[PDB]
Design an enzyme around this catalytic site. Sequence first.
Site, PDB file in Angstrom:
ATOM      1  N   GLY A 127       2.713  61.630  -6.561  1.00  0.00           N
ATOM      2  CA  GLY A 127       1.880  60.601  -7.114  1.00  0.00           C
ATOM      3  C   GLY A 127       0.517  61.161  -7.470  1.00  0.00           C
ATOM      4  O   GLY A 127       0.203  62.345  -7.318  1.00  0.00           O
ATOM      5  N   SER A 128      -0.351  60.277  -7.976  1.00  0.00           N
ATOM      6  CA  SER A 128      -1.593  60.771  -8.586  1.00  0.00           C
ATOM      7  C   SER A 128      -2.555  61.307  -7.545  1.00  0.00           C
ATOM      8  O   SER A 128      -3.269  62.270  -7.817  1.00  0.00           O
ATOM      9  CB  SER A 128      -2.253  59.710  -9.444  1.00  0.00           C
ATOM     10  OG  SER A 128      -2.532  58.561  -8.698  1.00  0.00           O
TER      11      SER A 128
ATOM     12  N   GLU B 144      -1.811  63.029  -5.111  1.00  0.00           N
ATOM     13  CA  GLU B 144      -1.198  64.258  -4.677  1.00  0.00           C
ATOM     14  C   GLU B 144      -1.239  65.339  -5.736  1.00  0.00           C
ATOM     15  O   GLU B 144      -1.018  66.525  -5.440  1.00  0.00           O
ATOM     16  CB  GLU B 144       0.233  63.892  -4.281  1.00  0.00           C
ATOM     17  CG  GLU B 144       0.292  62.983  -3.085  1.00  0.00           C
ATOM     18  CD  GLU B 144       0.049  61.539  -3.431  1.00  0.00           C
ATOM     19  OE1 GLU B 144       0.338  61.050  -4.560  1.00  0.00           O
ATOM     20  OE2 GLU B 144      -0.554  60.840  -2.608  1.00  0.00           O
TER      21      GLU B 144
ATOM     22  N   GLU C 226      11.088  57.559  -0.962  1.00  0.00           N
ATOM     23  CA  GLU C 226      10.539  58.304   0.176  1.00  0.00           C
ATOM     24  C   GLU C 226      11.417  58.265   1.429  1.00  0.00           C
ATOM     25  O   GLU C 226      11.303  59.185   2.233  1.00  0.00           O
ATOM     26  CB  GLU C 226       9.117  57.815   0.459  1.00  0.00           C
ATOM     27  CG  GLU C 226       8.184  58.075  -0.684  1.00  0.00           C
ATOM     28  CD  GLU C 226       8.151  57.107  -1.858  1.00  0.00           C
ATOM     29  OE1 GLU C 226       8.940  56.120  -1.861  1.00  0.00           O
ATOM     30  OE2 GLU C 226       7.328  57.331  -2.785  1.00  0.00           O
TER      31      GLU C 226
ATOM     32  N   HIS D  68       3.176  59.734  -1.453  1.00  0.00           N
ATOM     33  CA  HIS D  68       2.102  59.078  -2.170  1.00  0.00           C
ATOM     34  C   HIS D  68       1.486  57.928  -1.398  1.00  0.00           C
ATOM     35  O   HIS D  68       2.079  56.849  -1.296  1.00  0.00           O
ATOM     36  CB  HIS D  68       2.655  58.557  -3.543  1.00  0.00           C
ATOM     37  CG  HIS D  68       1.597  57.793  -4.241  1.00  0.00           C
ATOM     38  ND1 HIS D  68       0.454  58.385  -4.679  1.00  0.00           N
ATOM     39  CD2 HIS D  68       1.524  56.475  -4.597  1.00  0.00           C
ATOM     40  CE1 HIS D  68      -0.297  57.462  -5.260  1.00  0.00           C
ATOM     41  NE2 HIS D  68       0.318  56.298  -5.218  1.00  0.00           N
TER      42      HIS D  68
ATOM     43  N   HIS E 272      22.554  50.870  24.784  1.00  0.00           N
ATOM     44  CA  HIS E 272      22.585  50.082  23.551  1.00  0.00           C
ATOM     45  C   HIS E 272      23.028  48.664  23.867  1.00  0.00           C
ATOM     46  O   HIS E 272      22.199  47.773  23.870  1.00  0.00           O
ATOM     47  CB  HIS E 272      23.459  50.836  22.548  1.00  0.00           C
ATOM     48  CG  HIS E 272      23.639  50.222  21.222  1.00  0.00           C
ATOM     49  ND1 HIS E 272      24.440  50.874  20.305  1.00  0.00           N
ATOM     50  CD2 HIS E 272      23.187  49.112  20.636  1.00  0.00           C
ATOM     51  CE1 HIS E 272      24.467  50.167  19.204  1.00  0.00           C
ATOM     52  NE2 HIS E 272      23.720  49.075  19.375  1.00  0.00           N
TER      53      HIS E 272
ATOM     54  N   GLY F 267      19.238  54.732  15.276  1.00  0.00           N
ATOM     55  CA  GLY F 267      20.171  53.777  14.725  1.00  0.00           C
ATOM     56  C   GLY F 267      19.804  53.295  13.348  1.00  0.00           C
ATOM     57  O   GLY F 267      20.432  52.340  12.844  1.00  0.00           O
TER      58      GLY F 267
HETATM   59  C1  LIG Z   1      17.864  50.249   8.358  1.00  0.00           C
HETATM   60  C2  LIG Z   1      18.859  49.440   9.104  1.00  0.00           C
HETATM   61  N1  LIG Z   1      19.131  48.171   8.654  1.00  0.00           N
HETATM   62  C3  LIG Z   1      20.033  47.395   9.268  1.00  0.00           C
HETATM   63  C4  LIG Z   1      20.786  47.907  10.381  1.00  0.00           C
HETATM   64  C5  LIG Z   1      21.747  47.054  11.132  1.00  0.00           C
HETATM   65  N2  LIG Z   1      23.120  47.563  11.073  1.00  0.00           N
HETATM   66  C6  LIG Z   1      24.067  47.404  10.081  1.00  0.00           C
HETATM   67  C7  LIG Z   1      23.709  46.724   8.801  1.00  0.00           C
HETATM   68  C8  LIG Z   1      25.249  48.007  10.363  1.00  0.00           C
HETATM   69  C9  LIG Z   1      26.533  48.017   9.490  1.00  0.00           C
HETATM   70  C10 LIG Z   1      26.753  49.390   8.851  1.00  0.00           C
HETATM   71  O1  LIG Z   1      27.940  49.150   8.063  1.00  0.00           O
HETATM   72  P1  LIG Z   1      28.752  50.371   7.478  1.00  0.00           P
HETATM   73  O2  LIG Z   1      29.612  49.822   6.381  1.00  0.00           O
HETATM   74  O3  LIG Z   1      27.904  51.514   7.183  1.00  0.00           O
HETATM   75  O4  LIG Z   1      29.678  50.830   8.684  1.00  0.00           O
HETATM   76  P2  LIG Z   1      30.785  49.996   9.550  1.00  0.00           P
HETATM   77  O5  LIG Z   1      31.543  49.098   8.569  1.00  0.00           O
HETATM   78  O6  LIG Z   1      31.626  51.083  10.161  1.00  0.00           O
HETATM   79  O7  LIG Z   1      30.031  49.271  10.614  1.00  0.00           O
HETATM   80  S1  LIG Z   1      25.279  48.933  11.836  1.00  0.00           S
HETATM   81  C11 LIG Z   1      23.715  48.338  12.175  1.00  0.00           C
HETATM   82  O8  LIG Z   1      23.047  48.637  13.193  1.00  0.00           O
HETATM   83  C12 LIG Z   1      20.369  49.235  10.799  1.00  0.00           C
HETATM   84  N3  LIG Z   1      20.884  49.747  11.918  1.00  0.00           N
HETATM   85  N4  LIG Z   1      19.465  49.971  10.137  1.00  0.00           N
HETATM   86  C1  LIG Z   2       6.432  54.276  -3.884  1.00  0.00           C
HETATM   87  C2  LIG Z   2       5.691  55.117  -4.856  1.00  0.00           C
HETATM   88  N1  LIG Z   2       5.994  56.455  -4.920  1.00  0.00           N
HETATM   89  C3  LIG Z   2       5.377  57.265  -5.790  1.00  0.00           C
HETATM   90  C4  LIG Z   2       4.425  56.729  -6.725  1.00  0.00           C
HETATM   91  C5  LIG Z   2       3.670  57.607  -7.659  1.00  0.00           C
HETATM   92  N2  LIG Z   2       3.937  57.296  -9.066  1.00  0.00           N
HETATM   93  C6  LIG Z   2       4.990  57.697  -9.864  1.00  0.00           C
HETATM   94  C7  LIG Z   2       6.125  58.471  -9.278  1.00  0.00           C
HETATM   95  C8  LIG Z   2       4.914  57.228 -11.134  1.00  0.00           C
HETATM   96  C9  LIG Z   2       5.908  57.493 -12.298  1.00  0.00           C
HETATM   97  C10 LIG Z   2       6.743  56.248 -12.602  1.00  0.00           C
HETATM   98  O1  LIG Z   2       7.610  56.736 -13.650  1.00  0.00           O
HETATM   99  P1  LIG Z   2       8.432  55.712 -14.527  1.00  0.00           P
HETATM  100  O2  LIG Z   2       9.528  56.497 -15.179  1.00  0.00           O
HETATM  101  O3  LIG Z   2       8.788  54.510 -13.792  1.00  0.00           O
HETATM  102  O4  LIG Z   2       7.399  55.240 -15.637  1.00  0.00           O
HETATM  103  P2  LIG Z   2       6.548  56.105 -16.731  1.00  0.00           P
HETATM  104  O5  LIG Z   2       7.473  57.206 -17.256  1.00  0.00           O
HETATM  105  O6  LIG Z   2       6.177  55.075 -17.763  1.00  0.00           O
HETATM  106  O7  LIG Z   2       5.325  56.591 -16.029  1.00  0.00           O
HETATM  107  S1  LIG Z   2       3.588  56.145 -11.448  1.00  0.00           S
HETATM  108  C11 LIG Z   2       3.015  56.482  -9.877  1.00  0.00           C
HETATM  109  O8  LIG Z   2       1.982  55.977  -9.374  1.00  0.00           O
HETATM  110  C12 LIG Z   2       4.148  55.317  -6.521  1.00  0.00           C
HETATM  111  N3  LIG Z   2       3.166  54.749  -7.223  1.00  0.00           N
HETATM  112  N4  LIG Z   2       4.806  54.552  -5.640  1.00  0.00           N
END
Ligand SMILES: Cc1ncc(Cn2c(C)c(CCOP(=O)(O)OP(=O)(O)O)sc2=O)c(N)n1
Ligand SMILES: Cc1ncc(Cn2c(C)c(CCOP(=O)(O)OP(=O)(O)O)sc2=O)c(N)n1
EC number: 4.1.1.7
Lengths: 524, 524, 524
Positions: free
Chosen positions: A24-25, A27, A46, A69, A280, A400
């Site tokens: 980003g800018s 950076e 990210e 960023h 757990h 997890g």
């Molecule tokens: C970032 C995040 N969001 C939500 C969950 C909650 N979560 C979820 C949404 C699970 C289901 C994962 O489903 P899967 O299809 O990857 O695998 P299974 O069908 O084998 O459970 S396991 C679990 O803890 C998590 N752990 N982490």
């Molecule tokens: C979450 C996040 N990550 C990184 C950036 C840094 N960033 C980035 C990566 C940009 C480029 C977006 O590219 P785009 O293709 O969506 O659009 P343009 O080609 O018109 O710039 S604009 C900008 O501020 C951000 N703002 N937000």
Amino acid sequence: ASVHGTTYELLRRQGIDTVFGNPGSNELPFLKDFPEDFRYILALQEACVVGIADGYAQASRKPAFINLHSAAGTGNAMGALSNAWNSHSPLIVTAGQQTRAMIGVEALLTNVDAANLPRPLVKWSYEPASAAEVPHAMSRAIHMASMAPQGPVYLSVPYDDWDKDADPQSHHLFDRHVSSSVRLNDQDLDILVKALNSASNPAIVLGPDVDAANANADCVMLAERLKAPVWVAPSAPRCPFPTRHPCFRGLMPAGIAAISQLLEGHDVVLVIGAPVFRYHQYDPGQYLKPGTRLISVTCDPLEAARAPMGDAIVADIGAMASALANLVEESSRQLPTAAPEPAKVDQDAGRLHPETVFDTLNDMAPENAIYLNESTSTTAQMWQRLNMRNPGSYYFCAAGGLGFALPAAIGVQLAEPERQVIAVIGDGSANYSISALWTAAQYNIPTIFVIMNNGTYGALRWFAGVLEAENVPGLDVPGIDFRALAKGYGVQALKADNLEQLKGSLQEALSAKGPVLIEVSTVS
Amino acid sequence: ASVHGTTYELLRRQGIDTVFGNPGSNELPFLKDFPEDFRYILALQEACVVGIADGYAQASRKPAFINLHSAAGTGNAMGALSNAWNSHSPLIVTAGQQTRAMIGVEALLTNVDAANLPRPLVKWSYEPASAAEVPHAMSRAIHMASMAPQGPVYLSVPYDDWDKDADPQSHHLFDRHVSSSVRLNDQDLDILVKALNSASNPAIVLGPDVDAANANADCVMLAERLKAPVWVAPSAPRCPFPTRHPCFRGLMPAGIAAISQLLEGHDVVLVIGAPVFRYHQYDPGQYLKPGTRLISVTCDPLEAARAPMGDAIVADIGAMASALANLVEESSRQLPTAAPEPAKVDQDAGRLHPETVFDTLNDMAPENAIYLNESTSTTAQMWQRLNMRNPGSYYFCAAGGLGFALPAAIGVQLAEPERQVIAVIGDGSANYSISALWTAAQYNIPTIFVIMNNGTYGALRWFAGVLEAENVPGLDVPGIDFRALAKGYGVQALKADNLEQLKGSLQEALSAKGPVLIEVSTVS
Amino acid sequence: ASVHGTTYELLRRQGIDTVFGNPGSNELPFLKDFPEDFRYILALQEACVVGIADGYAQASRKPAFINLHSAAGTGNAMGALSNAWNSHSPLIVTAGQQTRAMIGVEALLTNVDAANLPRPLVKWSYEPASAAEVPHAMSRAIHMASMAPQGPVYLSVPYDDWDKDADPQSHHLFDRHVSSSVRLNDQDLDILVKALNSASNPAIVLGPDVDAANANADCVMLAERLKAPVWVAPSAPRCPFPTRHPCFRGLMPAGIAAISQLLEGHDVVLVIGAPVFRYHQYDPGQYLKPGTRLISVTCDPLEAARAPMGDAIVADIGAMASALANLVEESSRQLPTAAPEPAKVDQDAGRLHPETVFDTLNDMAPENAIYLNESTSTTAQMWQRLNMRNPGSYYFCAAGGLGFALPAAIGVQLAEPERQVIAVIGDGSANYSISALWTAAQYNIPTIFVIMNNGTYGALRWFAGVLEAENVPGLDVPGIDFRALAKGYGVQALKADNLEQLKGSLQEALSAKGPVLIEVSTVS
Ligand SMILES: Cc1ncc(Cn2c(C)c(CCOP(=O)(O)OP(=O)(O)O)sc2=O)c(N)n1
Ligand SMILES: Cc1ncc(Cn2c(C)c(CCOP(=O)(O)OP(=O)(O)O)sc2=O)c(N)n1
Ligand SMILES: Cc1ncc(Cn2c(C)c(CCOP(=O)(O)OP(=O)(O)O)sc2=O)c(N)n1
Ligand SMILES: [Ca+2]
Ligand SMILES: [Ca+2]
Ligand SMILES: [Ca+2]
Ligand SMILES: [Ca+2]
Ligand SMILES: [Ca+2]
Ligand SMILES: [Ca+2]
Ligand SMILES: [Ca+2]
Ligand SMILES: [Ca+2]
Ligand SMILES: [Ca+2]
Ligand SMILES: [Mg+2]
Ligand SMILES: [Mg+2]
């Protein structure tokens, strides 16, 4: 010299040569004049940047450097930092800040109260008070990430700092060597060794910091000398022991009562490199049964403090495992007998049982493959069905938090180019960090992604049934074409609707020269 | 009653009927017995959950309720919260915690030091000390999100709390009405009105809180009475004024010197509903030229405090805009003349100029369309080329954090089913929250997604050139097939490689009955 | 058992038998049924409570337990915690919270966001989520305070928790032994020993963690073997070495350039138990001169990380000092020669030069006296003029925060009843914690307090002169009668206006059976 030149010299002198980033800018003044001896690995979001870096750090057993960023980029990565905290991953997370002249007005892209943003998921978090402090703050970040217990750290840098003059006395930072490779003093170590030698029925429990330390072989020797069964601590982020060694007893269930029942009759239980314990499920009961004493060796004071039972020793896992393995007596007890192979689940010509998938992977994968698990309902079966002989062969999201394994498998593969990485990821989990696939395509990092497609959040459905919870919304994820997603990001895509197709797809994937995604139709 | 039943009654009594979520095990005891009068909107990653909820809240002008999984789910959403903070979005973010009996041991899924995790991006963050406090804490969350200045709040709830008995005295929470609909006292308001009436060359600057308050029409009347040109404050998250009204002068450049130059000669500048100012680029100079006085009306003490110049009044934007519009005199000066239409950029039969895309959208879209912008290099042209007559017609990531517009456009479309939403998103930006597409498909929310594909992070390339920064890595994003990604998530996909195909694709999209993604090949 | 009974059993089983406190209503349910085997030490303000406890912990080399009242009591103690952080003092700070039923409404005496209040001055800070967690949280507090690097911790407990039933499985907490008594692995220790043996002109620098570890005698042996001069690291909180041993070279000046100049020509400088370095004055220059290598042994990762130069080893100071002292070779170089005695400053029959006071104390005090210093302009002279043969003989506010020495001297005297404590405190410093005198009177703790009365903040006047800063307000403190203050709190009071009276007063004080304050008229 400028702060930019001094900082890159510090990084190189401290062994850093790769930047995982989404730019980003704020950076660009850091990333400009990017040194020719460094590599930049771009990812499209990210969580993916940090997951890739995390897998790289964990497999390489060295710090990984990240550039994000400002606040929004840092924020997008905070679920990845939750896992990195639990795995003790040595990650140096940097983020660009607005120019110092516009921080006060809170111009767009100002990271407000920046050091507080990633808390409580970092060991150290900081924004320097001046440009000339930046190299010193970077030094602090490197060492804070790298000292036991390893973990993520955060550094915010105003973008105008890079072009300013550095302190010439920052040269003293370049070659600093900082060690935490420590072990228990000899008198108390001898007490511990005598307690182990005197135990009549010892058991060993190993956690992820054993694999991080590459203490696995020393733990094998320790187990062999003590003639002791070896378990992996629950909710395991890594695999610390050869899974077909005769002492291996598998993954512990993550429940209080279940663990005390498993350890009943073991008079001394030596835990190395794990929290006590990463339970757990709610499974109330006794932490330990009468007659069991627990001793924990941990690299983390926070682990030692919170253990509800047992003695603890806070030390480096590598140093303690080596010392113990070389000091204990050879017991005259018989060596434990290896667990038998798991049963073959009946499999028709239709949708795949997960057990079938793991058996086929075990059959076809190289002996030095590395697996990642984000197939949350199938973990127990995975741990029973994969022969993992070598260190660094298994990763699972340590908090997890889904969205780890897809990017981390790319980082692991980058870290270990000679070892085929195979990520086994559920259809639900696959979406969290789906855009990470692009990095594998662009850098031709030949990870194999196995998507276990049963159309549901199966682990959650399961739990809803244990709760007898009715009318829970949001548990199904129909309508995702993972071959199309892989095409979208430039990764070769295969489907496996039955066992014949799974074997054909795996044969193809294993011989491919780039990353491959296999969508497997699994039993619902 | 249980805490679960009391809490859902509180939510319904306070007007909440929708839960935006990605579920997990700590949340199942909340989500079970999900009331039949509530709707659950699933998204596949938490940046998407919160973005959808944010668009919904912003367009609906009411709080949106979110449920995320512990620390990792919360963390995945923190970049979305960076935007929500800057837009004053009233978001009630809830996350499930481990059962109280296992918090101390830090079982898997424990959210450690939970209230600190989303700081500093929330107005209030809390974990209750007991189950019976949960309804009261939820009440606090609702009102803290909803009082001026609106913003996101966070509540962590141990999963065992829901089944416990509630305090019967929690009924007093249900119908509480909390108002911050306040304006400057009459004596001081009369001073302000006289200063406006006496100005010889007033200007008005409007920010996003005008659109949030639906104060747009009152601001039109105010501008008409004062015969004053009207600008949109820089880095605009929303559109506060009809863009073809004769007083409209467009988006201010986000630079200190540029703004003072623009305001030179205006003796009184009245800023309503904006920070003073959300600058971006480094453009040092005078905050105001001699002869200009600035007066800010802001809903946010933090804005008032940090303004580097001018007087300020901290009050509700709706109440102040109405009062001012009805109290000022009709000036005898001539009404400002409308800006001329923008120029037609020359366009061959090849790749599309962004100007061409915006002109075609303006030509074909309904007059009550709603636009979202995450095409970062084309913002100025977008603001010049779209006639947006109505309130609630524009959204742009208020902290600059990418990954907002794709999910938010789904939330906006859910909030405004009769108004066609058109999200214009760059190829780089599209990846951050790509999985949000699935929610549009599953719920048949007919958002149109226009992907501006020029293969690069064009805004960053541009800036690297203004820095004369050479050798910057990571600025190109080749090799993404957005039609395949849309197929992956079940959304109808079209391509536009030239203007004929863009018109054909837009005609098709506008008549479709479901969401549609159009990949447009734009000039690099 | 109740939480109250379980918690007091945990404390006793972990060696705690004393509560330093100032009570309040949220604490009465903890303090009721106060066990007969515990002692309560009351002080009249919380800076005094914590200072007393700090001196006790530092001298006893064991954790001290504190109980304060909610937020206001905790707040009153936060300057004392600033010192305790810098001294690595193992303090378990507990504070009572409102009953859980009234936390949400923020009843009077609610500690809002309690765990954040003492941050960033504590190693761990917490409020348990349930009553049955309280013993476990107390266990965590004990061990977090006690593990290297030691430091203060904070625990907030809702008052209704104490009477609730405890988890019977909390018995496993009682006898936990947690060790951080670790040292560098043998291979790397042998490298270090060889570097020390090979040095041609080594120097040793010692900090406070040497005295905390009682590593002083081992450091004497180390210095004798290496034939090396020994300095005390700057801003010294403790005395780590016999001050008339032939290798002793005194207190280092707290300046960058001054330290590198002092170390010039020393090829290896071994720092043990100190930050590198606790500089104070602005004295820019080289961190080290060419030809000097620095190696630090520190118990604190934060110290190791922030050192601007040198290698570091993070380990227990006691274990490392013993190992090094027993492993290095006996060098054939000549032993350093003892520093000569300091000069006798000319003294007339009027107001006392501070040098005169220190010489007289050195002449008359027992050889095992313990000194505290909060006479900020006279530190250099104090360090030159007191022969301190034994460990635990010196304390100075480790963060520079005044209000430490008066209460800490009472805690030290309580910890070491056979060793006469003599606190030398300036007239300015004496006021910060003046009410601590009452605790000495009430418990008949026979500390001697020597007030150096020159009527000014002399260290600040001095600095204002080095700045050539004119018109600085607030530097004079005329009009304080310290004999009257001592009478006010029940402590015997003497005056010394000249040397004859100082000797008479000290003779009287040394033979007294209770605490004594001597107001000395010192040269302005
Ligand atoms: C970032 C995040 N969001 C939500 C969950 C909650 N979560 C979820 C949404 C699970 C289901 C994962 O489903 P899967 O299809 O990857 O695998 P299974 O069908 O084998 O459970 S396991 C679990 O803890 C998590 N752990 N982490
Ligand atoms: C979450 C996040 N990550 C990184 C950036 C840094 N960033 C980035 C990566 C940009 C480029 C977006 O590219 P785009 O293709 O969506 O659009 P343009 O080609 O018109 O710039 S604009 C900008 O501020 C951000 N703002 N937000
Ligand atoms: C709690 C606190 N407040 C203010 C100061 C600032 N301060 C002050 C006020 C000093 C003067 C102490 O005066 P004294 O009479 O105790 O001793 P001298 O006359 O020998 O300096 S030394 C110093 O650092 C401090 N260090 N700690
Ligand atoms: Ca087989
Ligand atoms: Ca490698
Ligand atoms: Ca699944
Ligand atoms: Ca037109
Ligand atoms: Ca609506
Ligand atoms: Ca682009
Ligand atoms: Ca003498
Ligand atoms: Ca004692
Ligand atoms: Ca004085
Ligand atoms: Mg935070
Ligand atoms: Mg604080």
